[PDB]
Write a protein that holds these residues in place. Structure first.
Motif, PDB file in Angstrom:
ATOM      1  N   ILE A  95      30.438  15.583  36.374  1.00 49.95           N
ATOM      2  CA  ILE A  95      29.458  15.469  37.477  1.00 49.95           C
ATOM      3  C   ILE A  95      30.020  15.739  38.863  1.00 49.95           C
ATOM      4  CG2 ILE A  95      28.004  13.866  36.154  1.00 49.95           C
ATOM      5  CD1 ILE A  95      29.052  11.558  37.934  1.00 49.95           C
ATOM      6  N   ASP A  96      31.346  15.734  39.025  1.00 48.18           N
ATOM      7  CA  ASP A  96      31.948  16.020  40.332  1.00 48.18           C
ATOM      8  C   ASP A  96      33.426  16.265  40.159  1.00 48.18           C
ATOM      9  OD1 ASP A  96      32.007  16.407  43.120  1.00 48.18           O
ATOM     10  OD2 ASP A  96      31.539  14.358  43.598  1.00 48.18           O
ATOM     11  N   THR A  97      34.023  16.933  41.145  1.00 45.68           N
ATOM     12  CA  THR A  97      35.423  17.270  41.182  1.00 45.68           C
ATOM     13  C   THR A  97      35.954  17.161  42.608  1.00 45.68           C
ATOM     14  OG1 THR A  97      35.214  18.880  39.312  1.00 45.68           O
ATOM     15  CG2 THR A  97      37.062  19.121  40.687  1.00 45.68           C
ATOM     16  N   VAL A  98      37.161  16.601  42.756  1.00 47.02           N
ATOM     17  CA  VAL A  98      37.886  16.563  44.040  1.00 47.02           C
ATOM     18  C   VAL A  98      39.257  17.176  43.777  1.00 47.02           C
ATOM     19  CG1 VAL A  98      38.938  15.176  45.872  1.00 47.02           C
ATOM     20  CG2 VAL A  98      36.709  14.539  44.965  1.00 47.02           C
ATOM     21  N   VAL A  99      39.559  18.277  44.451  1.00 40.91           N
ATOM     22  CA  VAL A  99      40.841  18.941  44.267  1.00 40.91           C
ATOM     23  C   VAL A  99      41.845  18.533  45.305  1.00 40.91           C
ATOM     24  CG1 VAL A  99      42.074  21.164  44.418  1.00 40.91           C
ATOM     25  CG2 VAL A  99      39.875  21.008  43.200  1.00 40.91           C
ATOM     26  N   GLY A 100      43.039  18.186  44.841  1.00 42.97           N
ATOM     27  CA  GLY A 100      44.173  17.959  45.717  1.00 42.97           C
ATOM     28  C   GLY A 100      44.356  16.587  46.304  1.00 42.97           C
ATOM     29  N   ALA A 101      45.381  16.482  47.131  1.00 46.38           N
ATOM     30  CA  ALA A 101      45.779  15.222  47.741  1.00 46.38           C
ATOM     31  C   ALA A 101      44.977  15.028  49.003  1.00 46.38           C
ATOM     32  CB  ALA A 101      47.258  15.210  48.001  1.00 46.38           C
ATOM     33  N   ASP A 102      43.721  14.662  48.799  1.00 47.45           N
ATOM     34  CA  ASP A 102      42.761  14.524  49.871  1.00 47.45           C
ATOM     35  C   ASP A 102      42.178  13.113  49.820  1.00 47.45           C
ATOM     36  OD1 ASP A 102      40.668  14.725  51.691  1.00 47.45           O
ATOM     37  OD2 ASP A 102      40.218  16.798  51.189  1.00 47.45           O
ATOM     38  N   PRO A 103      42.817  12.153  50.484  1.00 46.48           N
ATOM     39  CA  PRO A 103      42.391  10.758  50.327  1.00 46.48           C
ATOM     40  C   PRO A 103      40.971  10.490  50.825  1.00 46.48           C
ATOM     41  CG  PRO A 103      44.010  10.940  52.040  1.00 46.48           C
ATOM     42  CD  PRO A 103      44.004  12.268  51.346  1.00 46.48           C
ATOM     43  N   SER A 104      40.538  11.113  51.921  1.00 41.29           N
ATOM     44  CA  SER A 104      39.182  10.840  52.403  1.00 41.29           C
ATOM     45  C   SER A 104      38.122  11.422  51.452  1.00 41.29           C
ATOM     46  CB  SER A 104      39.011  11.301  53.844  1.00 41.29           C
ATOM     47  OG  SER A 104      39.078  12.642  53.940  1.00 41.29           O
ATOM     48  N   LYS A 105      38.361  12.628  50.924  1.00 40.44           N
ATOM     49  CA  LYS A 105      37.420  13.211  49.970  1.00 40.44           C
ATOM     50  C   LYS A 105      37.385  12.414  48.665  1.00 40.44           C
ATOM     51  CE  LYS A 105      36.873  17.880  51.597  1.00 40.44           C
ATOM     52  NZ  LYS A 105      35.612  17.447  52.297  1.00 40.44           N
ATOM     53  N   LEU A 106      38.534  11.948  48.235  1.00 40.35           N
ATOM     54  CA  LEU A 106      38.604  11.129  47.017  1.00 40.35           C
ATOM     55  C   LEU A 106      37.813   9.831  47.218  1.00 40.35           C
ATOM     56  CD1 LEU A 106      39.634  10.478  44.220  1.00 40.35           C
ATOM     57  CD2 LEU A 106      41.763   9.683  45.275  1.00 40.35           C
ATOM     58  N   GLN A 107      38.060   9.140  48.327  1.00 41.66           N
ATOM     59  CA  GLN A 107      37.309   7.900  48.580  1.00 41.66           C
ATOM     60  C   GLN A 107      35.811   8.158  48.694  1.00 41.66           C
ATOM     61  OE1 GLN A 107      36.231   4.557  48.298  1.00 41.66           O
ATOM     62  NE2 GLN A 107      38.393   4.382  48.877  1.00 41.66           N
ATOM     63  N   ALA A 108      35.428   9.219  49.408  1.00 39.95           N
ATOM     64  CA  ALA A 108      33.991   9.495  49.576  1.00 39.95           C
ATOM     65  C   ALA A 108      33.311   9.690  48.217  1.00 39.95           C
ATOM     66  CB  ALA A 108      33.761  10.707  50.446  1.00 39.95           C
ATOM     67  N   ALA A 109      33.990  10.396  47.316  1.00 37.92           N
ATOM     68  CA  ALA A 109      33.412  10.668  46.006  1.00 37.92           C
ATOM     69  C   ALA A 109      33.345   9.381  45.177  1.00 37.92           C
ATOM     70  CB  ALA A 109      34.195  11.744  45.291  1.00 37.92           C
ATOM     71  N   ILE A 110      34.378   8.548  45.258  1.00 38.00           N
ATOM     72  CA  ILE A 110      34.342   7.272  44.525  1.00 38.00           C
ATOM     73  C   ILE A 110      33.163   6.384  45.013  1.00 38.00           C
ATOM     74  CG2 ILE A 110      35.620   5.109  44.125  1.00 38.00           C
ATOM     75  CD1 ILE A 110      38.140   6.980  43.920  1.00 38.00           C
ATOM     76  N   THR A 111      32.952   6.342  46.316  1.00 34.38           N
ATOM     77  CA  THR A 111      31.857   5.567  46.865  1.00 34.38           C
ATOM     78  C   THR A 111      30.520   6.146  46.424  1.00 34.38           C
ATOM     79  OG1 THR A 111      33.176   4.875  48.749  1.00 34.38           O
ATOM     80  CG2 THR A 111      30.809   4.676  49.014  1.00 34.38           C
ATOM     81  N   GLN A 112      30.408   7.469  46.463  1.00 35.50           N
ATOM     82  CA  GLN A 112      29.187   8.124  46.023  1.00 35.50           C
ATOM     83  C   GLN A 112      28.839   7.756  44.584  1.00 35.50           C
ATOM     84  OE1 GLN A 112      26.942  10.201  47.506  1.00 35.50           O
ATOM     85  NE2 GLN A 112      25.809  10.459  45.601  1.00 35.50           N
ATOM     86  N   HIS A 113      29.829   7.816  43.707  1.00 34.21           N
ATOM     87  CA  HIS A 113      29.530   7.636  42.287  1.00 34.21           C
ATOM     88  C   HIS A 113      29.570   6.185  41.786  1.00 34.21           C
ATOM     89  CE1 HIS A 113      29.167  11.908  42.083  1.00 34.21           C
ATOM     90  NE2 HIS A 113      30.411  12.088  42.492  1.00 34.21           N
TER      91      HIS A 113
END
Length: 115
Positions: A95-113
């Motif tokens: 349902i989603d993918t976050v590429v790389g060492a991107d802490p803000s994008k990783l957190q945003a996706a975790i909160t979203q899901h």
């Protein structure tokens, strides 16, 4: 002086293709960190992923790791193109993918899901 933390997070290793199918197969959203020992940026973002597993989002979303070198069948089915890659699943589907060492994008996706 107020309290000591009692960690409740769980980052679990996925060690087989059957386990992969079982944990990604249900209504509960899971997130998998696809990593390898030869991956440099994995060493920067991995600890971040581990700390996020200890947050209340970890009660709603399951946190796992897959060593791409050791789990070729999983990596090929998922279609990993970069490392690290964080892939979210629900009901057997990506349902989603976050590429790389991107802490803000990783957190945003975790909160979203984890809503």
């Amino acid at each position: 002086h107020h309290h000591h933390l009692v960690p409740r997070g769980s980052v679990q290793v996925i060690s087989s293709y059957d386990q992969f199918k079982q944990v990604t197969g249900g209504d509960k959203v899971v997130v998998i960190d696809f990593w390898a020992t030869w991956c440099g940026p994995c060493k920067m973002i991995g600890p971040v992923f581990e700390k996020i597993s200890d947050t209340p989002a970890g009660d709603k979303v399951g946190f796992y790791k897959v060593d791409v070198d050791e789990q070729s069948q999983i990596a090929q089915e998922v279609g990993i193109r970069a490392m690290p890659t964080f892939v979210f699943f629900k009901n057997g589907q990506k349902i989603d993918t976050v590429v790389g060492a991107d802490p803000s994008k990783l957190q945003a996706a975790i909160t979203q899901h984890s809503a």
